[PDB]
């Protein structure tokens, strides 16, 4: 039989291992020839594997690279302007790769050029709350200072935006061992920890969903009109550069001024973590100087797009997409994920060769330039937005399959909760101690839902990956799943060797997943989800799961507001309309579900599959959220303080945030009320898409 | 048989006459009790007629009314400030209605209050070109002047916007006999001409598609957050009032300053048509004073929404909509149209009672507050936007069935051209001299296409009626048809008694359509279109007709640009991408049409009906046109100089308009190129929705 079990059984751990090895021998930086070569290789193999068509879709987008003949570095400069200390020009290459060419040195992509010199202020993680503490409580002024921040907690672009708005003239990012060195494990190559010479690459844009900075709204095709650099979206205005903890220790050890305000500001290095500004008495005349010479350059990128045409509903698309570009070798990020997609295609192709086709069309994507701001996926979605919004059933992302070896991590629309629970109950746990048990059982045990006994935790979708355009811009139901660590406090920080030259095939094979069983389990989860979404006669979405979370989010936003009872009285701020809409959504969703259970009529079925498919779409507001036009979903947006995290009722949340500091409370509470009305209306409108149609 | 002929034969001239009489005995001004009563009557009768459900949908929107105890009027005021001449407080009521209560006096809806006093400047029709001529050629400065403009040529809101931007401190609108009195016909009640005491009411907003000025984007429901008046959309900033030609003659007769620049500035009254400013020597110290006391007030309005559920595709909606509110008795505008809708419902209901249902759902709408800015239709569409955009097949408007008795007038999407030609070939001409001939034959003869021998003229959709939200905001294929006059130069001016108390049942019965045969022919056209759209197995749209017009519009915009060859060289302005996209659209549309002809498979059919339905939708850009976010269609928008007229490739058109006057040509031509790229991309994207889906 050609059924999900046939699909799942064809997947092999050994194939995923071979593909990962194949994809990680040389760097595949976006815009480079080696990444174009790998695109062509994947295109060829997907054809060989049996897909109906496999094309490259190319765009010319703004990328950023260091100047090969004029290296980026930071100095401590004395009174005379002698540079007495210089940060490294490169990470020490790992064993056996000390000769591999074209390893991009650590840099912050899209930094402007400059050579600012000044006094350091240490700003902890450079979060909103850290800047509040400095400016409001400690009365330290970052204006004209170079700020030094530890990586972790939040997306680095938010750190840079926050430092910019505090008036910094430059930013130094570093990896603290507190955040990137797990106690009791060895540094690479002897373990999975970050060495003191290791450095995390990464872009520092604030795109808010725009895609290529030069062509917001429209694909960066051959005839595209581009903005000038001065009008580009999301570029930082101050130089930024990342360093490792050996170099950071040299910059931090001499810091003076104020003590750290408390222990949450102290990392693990042997330094006081003084906030500054400047150095202690003896060194008070020394300064820090950055030298940044990177250039932004419009560069061609290539997505690979594979199609497996549906037998019955070829005009309904289920999309499995993940990126191919890497900072260096991409051992975890993204080739762990791409090897799994490759094996999924291979398995589907095997069934296809035996005469099977999925009911709906499956699209497979190898995205380019994800590392430079989700550019490949977003440009292709801009090009194809009309097809995706009227035909897009679901999007499953497929970046790194693993970031740990403890248990499963799933973020998805509530519409897929039931699908995920049911599938995981049917898969074998790969975990030690759970042999013979389901993945559901091991996952539920290791990661319990905070809300419900006997269920696992599933999180809201945030951002920082290629599902952003499909979910928050276009409103297509989206999901993602990977194996993760047990390190609750490091949730948004990344695994130690994130975006470092040390992220290699050997890292994975030796220390993460020697038997490739966690990769195989993730291939079963991602592939199984795609199989059910593409083959189930009724789409496997349960609208009642949305009703449950809408009530939780309404309770949560109401609680936030109720910290300000006097203002809610003065300004007549009521959540009644939002609770009413949620109540209605609950009631209508319950009725729709009964009808879905209670209908040989393919029109009624497709009418009802259309209602299911367009239900995520109904949460889109075509006017977007305030000052963020490409975040259109009214229930979920990436947090304005941390792009990785999702926020619920983001429009109301942002209207309430720090409201006690607004100078015009009447205006500020008016805007709260406006956002309550938008959210209540959108909930009611989405509910009504599930009413009888006539 | 239950077929289109059964539908059409059930329609009766005599019924339309009875309904028109019934709808025109008392005023039905939006927001008034009598218009709520008529809403309830229509609701009851539509239920009686057999529709499955008939509801009222109410909203609370900004309307505008004169102050009953403080009348609006204009004076000539002498040196001392004695008012030596005052305009009328009301139009002389017509015979037999001199006792009818609650006739709203002439006023300009949404005028602010004020009592400005100053010197007159006469600005012809107050068009863009008229202001250019005054300021640029004649060097007359309107700043701080009261401008007096004749009605005609363009929407009155554009006149007021233009006078405002010229710095006028007030506007007087009047009906010139040149434009509102046809030679050789008698004034009402002895003929269809405007008497010198007659005055045209009408709103002077510039909403650009927004709907209720206080709630752009969102329905004006019970919990809606409203903007403050200062932030409302589209309100004029200077007082405005309309008068008749007896009063205008008194204001114009004393004008001095410059002669009219040419004969196109002279109307038919016995006055010089001096542009001013001010009065000739003897009267140079007299001034004009307006007194406006109207108030804007949030007021409840009621749409009636009738549903006839589809037998096969109940989730596909074909909408017949027209308004019910009138300025006074609404003899032509809108009850001529509403009586026809009423008879169409009655006929469909007759078939329904015999067991028939249409294949798709038909929605019938009686809109409120159209006269105050398309408020009823636009609020309901805002409420229901998700349903309409995923299920809306087509919208047929149904305002006035007649504005003349000469021949048919049709504006529609190119997707309905073939449908209109085919239907009119099947209907009887009602015209004298064409007995036994088709409507197609008489219409083609009296109104030949400028492009093609043997075809009739069909125009682009403009605006100024309730299709605006459905076509230019939401991208639903739209059409409209009425009987019209032979008066080419009066195309956008209106029939003489437009929006006057003299627009009565008697006007129509005596002078327009005594046998109600033109009404019946229009009921057959509108009803026939709805029947085919709702019942045809394959949607009756021909995508190739769009390809033909896209090429015409591309040629036209290219020609406009080519008036500036040096700039196109300097700035590298190329239309190549737009012509390429049009060529592609032509080729793909040709292939789609062959597939549509060449397929028992209901999925392929519905897939292909979805492609047809979503093809108009593909021309929508979710970012809207510059500074006009609710005009989203890239091929058609209402002209920025005249809301009644449609403009093609409006984004490029507006970028090219008056470009030789821009101070920064590089920036201005950059914006031309940007609009060419948006249009080329949108055309290509729409084409690709017609490609094979996988
Ligand atoms: C959740 O679903 C329910 C439907 O089950 C829906 O109920 C609707 O609520 C509105 C209130 O927001 C009702 O609106 C009323 O309609 C009547 C006419 O039917 C009007 O007369 C009412 O207006 C008067 O009273 C108001 C309040 O005191 C005054 O402000 C106003 O000036 C008038 O005096 C009012 O407009 C509507 O009838 C029901 N519909 C039903 C029960 O079918 C509810 O709105 C949904 N929630 C959301 C958030 O959409
Ligand atoms: C109308 O439909 C046709 C398809 O029948 C479609 O043709 C496409 O046109 C683009 C040009 O805009 C082609 O893009 C080229 O793609 C190749 C790879 O296939 C690239 O190497 C080319 O880039 C080089 O050359 C450029 C021009 O000299 C340089 O600017 C660039 O730096 C590179 O050197 C170029 O990107 C594309 O291949 C075809 N696709 C086909 C034929 O299938 C056309 O675009 C459609 N019209 C619109 C408006 O969409
Ligand atoms: O430009 C952009 O918007 C992002 C570009 C780029 N993307 C990535 O590197 N994403 C990979 C991964 N990120 C990390 O592992 C860093 C920690 C944050 N991630 C999660 O917490 C996390 C991880 C998995 C899951 I399931 C949930 C949260 C990730 O977030 O996927 C970058 O961040 O530099
Ligand atoms: O606020 C708004 O946007 C409009 C509100 C209001 N609407 C109307 O009165 N519309 C009725 C009718 N208008 C007229 O007859 C005036 C002349 C312009 N119409 C057409 O040229 C015309 C007529 C029929 C056809 I077919 C094509 C063009 C009309 O345009 O339908 C108004 O104009 O004051
Ligand atoms: C990764 O695997 C691919 C596919 O097996 C290898 O590319 C093939 O290499 C052989 C020998 O050079 C060629 O004859 C084929 O034409 C290639 N197939 C393609 C590109 O589809 C590639 O060499 C492997 N890379 C590494 C680093 O092992
Ligand atoms: C997940 O599995 C549950 C349990 O099988 C499914 O719920 C059942 O669905 C069937 C088929 O429609 C109903 O007859 C049962 O009453 C349901 N059992 C329940 C709710 O306890 C559920 O539909 C599955 N979720 C999917 C497919 O998304
Ligand atoms: C317009 O027609 C309607 C419907 O025939 C008339 O309203 C009816 O009037 C009779 C007598 O007053 C009532 O018994 C019915 O209840 C009404 N039917 C409704 C409202 O559905 C109305 O009188 C007519 N108006 C004019 C001006 O002739
Ligand atoms: C309008 O009528 C024409 C002539 O009947 C229709 O075109 C024909 O459609 C049939 C049925 O698909 C084809 O087999 C013929 O070849 C067509 N004749 C032509 C193009 O000359 C046309 O489809 C009708 N338009 C509609 C229904 O929108
Ligand atoms: C890189 O730096 C060198 C000098 O070290 C300079 O000549 C060259 O222009 C730079 N390349 C760029 C800006 O791409
Ligand atoms: C740091 O680099 C600069 C530039 O090459 C050089 O002048 C200086 O000697 C270096 N300082 C140290 C301590 O190596
Ligand atoms: C921070 O410093 C700069 C002056 O160097 C000043 O413009 C700004 O107002 C200061 N902010 C404070 C003290 O709050
Ligand atoms: C793999 O699992 C073991 C067992 O808990 C753990 O100690 C080890 O650190 C894990 N590897 C990684 C990279 O987490
Ligand atoms: C109308 O005018 C009268 C005085 O003539 C005034 O008292 C009343 O307030 C006005 N009504 C309004 C502004 O609605
Ligand atoms: C015009 O009306 C005003 C206000 O009622 C009045 O004072 C004046 O006498 C009137 N003038 C004429 C000529 O009727
Ligand atoms: C028109 O008149 C006003 C002064 O009353 C002035 O501000 C404006 O510049 C003038 N425009 C001209 C003369 O172009
Ligand atoms: C009705 O038709 C006749 C015949 O051409 C024409 O003379 C008359 O003016 C028409 N009525 C109207 C209102 O146009
Ligand atoms: Ca873009
Ligand atoms: Ca509104
Ligand atoms: Cl992922
Ligand atoms: Cl109309
Ligand atoms: Zn990644
Ligand atoms: Zn990454
Ligand atoms: Zn009208
Ligand atoms: Zn009107």
UniProtKB/Swiss-Prot annotation, chains A, B:
Changing residue 370 to Q: Reduces enzyme activity. Its main location: membrane. The NAALADase activity is inhibited by beta-NAAG, quisqualic acid, 2-(phosphonomethyl) pentanedioic acid (PMPA) and EDTA. Activated by cobalt. The lineage of its organism: Eukaryota, Metazoa, Chordata, Craniata, Vertebrata. This is Glutamate carboxypeptidase 2. The active site is at residues 370, 574, 610, 633. Its cofactor is Zn(2+). The keyword Phosphoprotein applies. Its EC number is 3.4.17.21. One of its GO terms (cellular component) is cell surface. Changing residue 586 to A: Abolishes enzyme activity. Stable at pH greater than 6.5. Changing residue 584 to A: Loss of glycosylation. Abolishes enzyme activity. Changing residue 325 to E/N: Complete loss of activity. Belongs to the peptidase M28 family. M28B subfamily. SUPFAM superfamilies: PA domain, Transferrin receptor-like dimerisation domain, Zn-dependent exopeptidases.
């Amino acid at each position: 039989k050609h059924n999900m079990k046939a699909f799942l059984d064809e997947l092999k751990a050994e194939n995923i291992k071979k593909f990962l090895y194949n994809f990680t021998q040389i760097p595949h930086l976006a815009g480079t020839e080696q990444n174009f070569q790998l695109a062509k290789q994947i295109q060829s193999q997907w054809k060989e594997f049996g897909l109906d068509s496999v094309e490259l879709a190319h765009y010319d987008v703004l990328l950023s690279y260091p100047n090969k003949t004029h290296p980026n570095y930071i100095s401590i400069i004395n009174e005379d302007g002698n540079e007495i200390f210089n940060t490294s020009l490169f990470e020490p290459p790992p064993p056996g790769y000390e000769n591999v060419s074209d390893i991009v040195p650590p840099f912050s992509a899209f930094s402007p050029q400059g050579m600012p010199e000044g006094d350091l202020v240490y700003v902890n993680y450079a979060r909103t709350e850290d800047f509040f503490k400095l400016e409001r409580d400690m009365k330290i002024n970052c204006s004209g200072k170079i700020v030094i921040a530890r990586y972790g907690k939040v997306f680095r672009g938010n750190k840079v935006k926050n430092a910019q708005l505090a008036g910094a003239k430059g930013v130094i990012l570093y990896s603290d061992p507190a955040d990137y060195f797990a106690p009791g494990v060895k540094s690479y190559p002897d373990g999975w920890n970050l060495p003191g010479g290791g450095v995390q690459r990464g872009n520092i844009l604030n795109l808010n969903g725009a895609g290529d900075p030069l062509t917001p709204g429209y694909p960066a095709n051959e005839y595209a009109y581009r903005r000038g650099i001065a009008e580009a979206v999301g570029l930082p205005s101050i130089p930024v550069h990342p360093i490792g903890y050996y170099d950071a220790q040299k910059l931090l050890e001499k810091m003076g001024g104020s003590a750290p305000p408390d222990s949450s500001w102290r990392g693990s290095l042997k330094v006081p973590y003084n906030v500054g500004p400047g150095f202690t008495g003896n060194f008070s005349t020394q300064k820090v100087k950055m030298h940044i010479h990177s250039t932004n350059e419009v560069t061609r990128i290539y997505n690979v797009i594979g199609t497996l045409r549906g037998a019955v509903e070829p005009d309904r698309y289920v999309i499995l997409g993940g990126h191919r570009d890497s900072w260096v070798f991409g051992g975890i990020d993204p080739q762990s994920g791409a090897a799994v997609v490759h094996e999924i295609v291979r398995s589907f192709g095997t069934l296809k060769k035996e005469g099977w086709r999925p009911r709906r069309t499956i699209l497979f994507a190898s995205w380019d330039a994800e590392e430079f701001g989700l550019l490949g996926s977003t440009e292709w979605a801009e090009e194809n937005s009309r097809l995706l919004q009227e035909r897009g059933v679901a999007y499953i992302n497929a970046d790194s399959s693993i970031e740990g070896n403890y248990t499963l991590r799933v973020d998805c629309t509530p519409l897929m909760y039931s699908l995920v629970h049911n599938l995981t109950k049917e898969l074998k746990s790969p975990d030690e101690g759970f042999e013979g048990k389901s993945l559901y059982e091991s996952w539920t045990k290791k990661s319990p839902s905070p809300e419900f006994s006997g269920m696992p935790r599933i999180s809201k979708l945030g951002s920082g990956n290629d599902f952003e355009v499909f979910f928050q811009r276009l409103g297509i139901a989206s999901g993602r799943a990977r194996y993760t660590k047990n390190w609750e406090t490091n949730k948004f920080s990344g695994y130690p060797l994130y975006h470092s030259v040390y992220e290699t095939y050997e890292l994975v094979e030796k220390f993460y997943d020697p038997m490739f069983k966690y990769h195989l389990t993730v291939a079963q989860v991602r592939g199984g989800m795609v199989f059910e979404l593409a083959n189930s006669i009724v789409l496997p979405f349960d609208c009642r799961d949305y009703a449950v979370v809408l009530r939780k989010y309404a309770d949560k936003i109401y609680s936030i507001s109720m910290k300000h009872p006097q203002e809610m009285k003065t300004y007549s701020v009521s959540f009644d309309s939002l609770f009413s809409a949620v109540k209605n959504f609950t009631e209508i969703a319950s009725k729709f579900s009964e009808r879905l259970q209670d209908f040989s009529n393919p029109i009624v079925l497709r009418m009802m599959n259309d209602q299911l498919m367009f239900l995520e779409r109904a949460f889109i507001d075509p006017l977007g959220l305030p000052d963020r036009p490409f975040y259109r979903h009214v229930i979920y947006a990436p947090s304005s303080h941390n792009k990785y995290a999702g926020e619920s009722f983001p429009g109301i949340y942002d209207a309430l945030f720090d409201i006690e500091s607004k100078v015009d409370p009447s205006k500020a509470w008016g805007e709260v009320k406006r956002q309550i009305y938008v959210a209540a209306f959108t909930v009611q409108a989405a509910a009504e898409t599930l009413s009888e149609v006539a």
